[model samples]
Target: MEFRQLKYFIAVAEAGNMAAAAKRLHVSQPPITRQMQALEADLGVVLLERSHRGIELTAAGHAFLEDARRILELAGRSGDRSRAAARGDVGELSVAYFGTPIYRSLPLLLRAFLTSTPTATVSLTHMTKDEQVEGLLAGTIHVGFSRFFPRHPGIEIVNIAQEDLYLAVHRSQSGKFGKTCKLADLRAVELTLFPRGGRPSFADEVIGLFKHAGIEPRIARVVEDATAALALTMAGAASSIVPASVAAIRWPDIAFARIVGTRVKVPISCIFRKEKQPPILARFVEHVR
Candidate 1:
């Protein structure tokens, strides 16, 4: 009737002797005898043929033996399924990406996440920082990797990585500075910034580099995204400030230089709707750490 009884029955059937079965199961033989008796009484069928030397299985015992083994195996497998599901090892998650984290930190985070939760699936969507905020709020996506750490009520943002600002100059103007340049070194250089008009935009973040160094930028043009800014920089309109990850992804005509002697950094952050955070999203946040 109970799993304990099935286990005892299987042990008895396999050993063909209560004395041996009890010893193998680390219990006394009399308890085994009572259990077998109780099991047969509960089932209303004879199972074992008792003898002076040993026992033999009847037709019912052979049939019941197979069922007990299968039930135990299934019980074990059920626990496996339960654990995997609870651990977020199997579920659907949508993640939105903005900016350089897509090229840098996001790949590293998912590489580690997917290894442990190999059964779980992740879908990546590209969006602006504002769009990422909207996706998380509307539940269009479960989580977002975004730069500039834009704010939204009922949403949580955690910083995962910080990218240093780079000065991307046209190839023709390559020798104008050393391998790296400080803020003052760039004072003579005209600048163009991207995502031009947000309160805490990457443009604002980059302009702070000039602001702190006591230099007012000789602004050339304001563009919507990095591609627009890079295009202007390539055309010798002005040098563009971008994430250091750009060096890995930029075209050969574009050159990267570190902004020396200062920490003009932008965050790569994770955002999720907190009111009903999904288990898979929680697991992903942990993996990001």
Candidate 2:
């Protein structure tokens, strides 16, 4: 009828006596006998035949014993899986990240986490800040990484890295480059920026800076990601502003100049639903921090 009853029945059947079974199981004889009696009564079957020598199993008892073993085995396996999930050893984790984090930090985090939690299954998706927040709220993703932190209920932010913004220009424009350029310097230069969907808050902040400088930037093109914008800059199509780390990386025919201004750096933060975060999410947050 119950797992405990089944266990007691199995123990008594194996030991052939309540006294011996109770001693082997480290329980009082009365409890074991009561559980075996309850199990037989629940099934409405005579499971044991008593004799002077020992207790013998009836035909129904032999058949019930196999089912009892299977049930106990399944129960043990279920407990193991539950413990593993709670410990972050095994579960499915869906992660979403913006483009720059994918380039800068994602590979190392993925490799390290996967190596440590081998049984934990992970799926990674690339998304914009808005999309990441939407995914988290909708319960489609377990964890997310992005630059913009949305003011949403039930979301927790973990700040991972802060990077300075840089000006990416063509190799031919290298001579005109200084150590740092102000927002006013970009007034006449045609700029290709990451699309609004890619990084809405950041793109708006950069535009606001130019507005504050009394300069209207020449918007040349809008690409979906920083890497694409940088590629266009290298090709001499347009100049772009991106994180310093992304610009410093090896790229043919491209030069990066630091953007000189107060509060020009962007903080990259990881976001997740505060209430629904799985144990693996905490592990990732600890590693990223």
Candidate 3:
């Protein structure tokens, strides 16, 4: 009926006598006898046959002993798994990220996290800012990393990294330009940019700089992700404003020039539900930070 009763039953079944079982378990014989009696009463079955010399198992005791051992083993395993989960050693983590971080820093971070917590299963998805907000609120994703943070009551955002934006110009174009370029320098040049995904702050900031310089950029093409933008620039389709790291890694035929008078920085942040953050999510936040 209870774990303690099962334990006592197993002990008596192993020891073959009440006094020996209680001595092995560091208890008194009368208490062990009483516990065994209560266990048999609860099960409505006879467990042990009494003898002057000692005690022997009845039919029901023989059958129930194996089940009792199995139950104890299962309980122990359950306790171990629960402890492991509490300590952030075993669980599933669903995460979402935008494309730039995927190319820049996410692979290295994932490799390190996986090596450290091998038992922790992780599912990674790619989503836009609006989708990330929806997924977080809908309890579909445990955490998210992205360039834009959503303004939602259930979500909490922490800024993790800020990267500078640079203009990727073809080497030939760079040779024709002056030492430094202002927003007006890009007037006749074709431009490639990220598509609108609910957050237009980055593009808006760049446009504001162009407006202040009184130059309208030549609308060449707009791409959805950093990798595509970089590829387009490499193929000489158009120049793009991208994170400095992306330009450094993907394009060698192009030269990156800082946009002077425009102190623009793209922010990378972690997002999670403020109300019901799991311990594993906290662990990831600590590790990411």
Candidate 4:
């Protein structure tokens, strides 16, 4: 009928005698005797047989005892899991992302968190900057990693990483530039940019970065994403200005190098609702930073 009743039934059944179970459980004989009677009345089945020597278990009692033991064990386990989850040791978290090799150790950072929390799971959704912003506001995701910092009243930003912008060019045409290229070099070269999709458009950002150095990007065409931009660069159609961290993904016949003495830096940001953040999101934030 209840957990205490189950425990009482278990102790008496295991002891094989009413008097000994009562003594072991630190209670008198009547309380034990009446409890077993009450238990039998509730179940409508006799769980024990009183004999001259001791108590003997009925067939139903054996099955019930095993079940009661398991239920108690499961209850204990349930409590442990709940406490672990509350402390951010075990649980599921949803994180939104903009797909790019934005920071080299970014994935490595996630794996680091996962390894520490083997019982935890992380779900990743790749979305546009605005979509990530929308998802965070709508509570569809717990946190976001993006290139654009959407300055919304409900959204909060955590500075993740900043990287130097680099030129990804075909190695065959590598000789056209000096040992290290300069921002002025981009003036003559046609530019291939990414995410023919959304704002904080890579084209605009790259163009703006160039303008600060007194150069204008020779407009070619915008492609779908970074992979497309890289493909275009490999064909010698145009060079790509990508974050330096993307160099972690090695592309054959392509080179990544710095632009000497440029103030241009690409920012990688983490976004979440400015309101109350769950413990899991906070734990993930700690690991990423």
Candidate 5:
């Protein structure tokens, strides 16, 4: 039942006698003899037969010997695995993502993390900034990737990547803007923003751009995520601005024009609890940085 007993049993069975096992283990013979008797009594099975020549294994002892060897091997391996976990070399990580990062940054970050930490297991979820912060505070998730940094003091946000903004317009209107455009150019165009939920989200980011430019944007529709905004734009509903990375996902009806003449930077951040940062999380944060 005990690992110490298993270790002693294996050495004794392999050495074939108490004195030899004790010598091999650098222990006293009398203690090994007492341990063998105790083991047999504990298991209610005769394990060894002693005579003038030496000790021979009983049928029960032969079966126990094989099992004891296997148990000892597993016990040793468990110790190594636990130590590796402590060192952040292997473990499970729960991550959440929202918005446009799912199109590029999140995938690249996860791929790099797995490539470097091959033994780590990662579970991903799609969550809004509010939901991500809630999950982090409730200890349901370890990391969250999002466009807007939550204002929660309990969360630590790290900027992983920055992208330029791009205006996604209908292919028919794309000809009017040519290759590039300015924030002022959207003054007459109805714009769809996202996400509808969560304050100070990417929706606010877009609204702020127009507000700062001294132009009143004609707000058309509010959707839940970037994909919806882009889809609406493709359907000629309204124009939407997206991160530069999202342009990689080509839509035939949508044209992505770089928003020029501005210095706005769209940053993707990974957020986690300020306290109780697990070792694996620390390693992941390093990778993100």
Candidate 6:
């Protein structure tokens, strides 16, 4: 009927007597006898055939003993899993991301965390800055990695790293810039902006970089994500500004040149709920830092 009762029943069945089970369990004889009787009465079954010499297990008592052992083992496993989750050793982490390279920064970040917590599962979802903020507020996403920092209330933002921005230009136009390109070089060039969806997005950040460097970029087209921007750059429609990590995407037609003249570095940041963050999220933030 209960874990304590199951343990006593197992001890009594193994010892084949009430006195010895109590002795083995470091208890007195009468309490064990009373508990065995109470357990049989609770189950309405004869568990022990008591005689002067010893006790024997009934047909139902043997079957019940096996089931009780299994139940106790399962209960112990459940407690272990609960404690592991509470300690952030095992759980699911849903991460929302934008702009950062999937093959580079993200995999390395998760690898460091996974080396410590091998049981934790992480899922990556592409989301704009506004969608990530909204998902965090609604509790759908556990953490977010993005280049732009959203200053909304109830969201905690941590800048994990800063990456130098690069210019992705077509091979034909690559010769115009050196290994390191200045913002002034992009003045006459048509700039392709990314993430056409959200305001105060990475597109805005790129535009702000240009403005801060005293250049009004000639906007040629606006696209949804960095991939789209790079595609446009490869087609020679316009040049795209991307984080340095995205250089891992090697395209023969696309040339990546580092932006050197500006003091502005693209920020790789993670966002989560400001209050009562879950253990998985807190653990991930620690790894990110």
Ranking according to lDDT, highest score first:
5, 6, 1, 2, 4, 3
- Using lDDT as the measure, the top candidate is 5
Candidate 2 per-residue lDDT over residues 1-289, each given as its tens digit: 8889988888888998768988889999778778878888999999988898677899999999999999999999999999987888887779998757677666667788888888877898987677888889888998887777777878888887778888888889986867688877777888887756643566776786788778899877777778678778877888888876586577989888888876677777788888866787776666666
Best by TM-score: 4
Which is the winner by lDDT between candidate 3 and candidate 6?
6
TM-score of 6: 0.85
Q: Worst ten-residue run, lDDT, model 1?
A: 244-253
Candidate 3 per-residue C-alpha lDDT over 166-192 given as tens digits, one digit per residue, 9 for 90 to 100: 788766677655545667777877887
Q: How many backbone clashes does candidate 3 have?
A: 0
Model 6 local distance difference test score = 0.83
Ranking by TM-score: 4, 6, 5, 3, 1, 2
Better of 1 and 2 by TM-score: 1
lDDT (CA) per prediction: 0.81, 0.80, 0.77, 0.79, 0.84, 0.83
For residue 248, model 4's alpha carbon misses the true position, in angstroms, by 1.0
For residue 124, what is the lDDT in candidate 3? 90
Residues 39-156, candidate 5: write the lDDT tens digits.
8889999998888868788899999999998888888899999998887889888999888888888888889998999999999899877889899999899999987775888888
RMSD of each candidate? 4.1, 4.9, 4.4, 2.7, 3.1, 2.8
Candidate 5 worst ten-residue window by lDDT: 258-267
User: What TM-score should be assigned to candidate 4?
Assistant: 0.87
Report how far off residue 30 is in candidate 2 (Å): 4.7
Query: Candidate 6 regions off by >4 Å?
Result: 15-24, 50-55, 101-103, 172-178
Which structure is stronger by lDDT: 1 or 4?
1
The C-alpha local distance difference test score for the whole of candidate 3 amounts to 0.77
lDDT of 1 by residue, 21-85 (tens): 87889999778888888989999999999788688889998999999999999999999988877
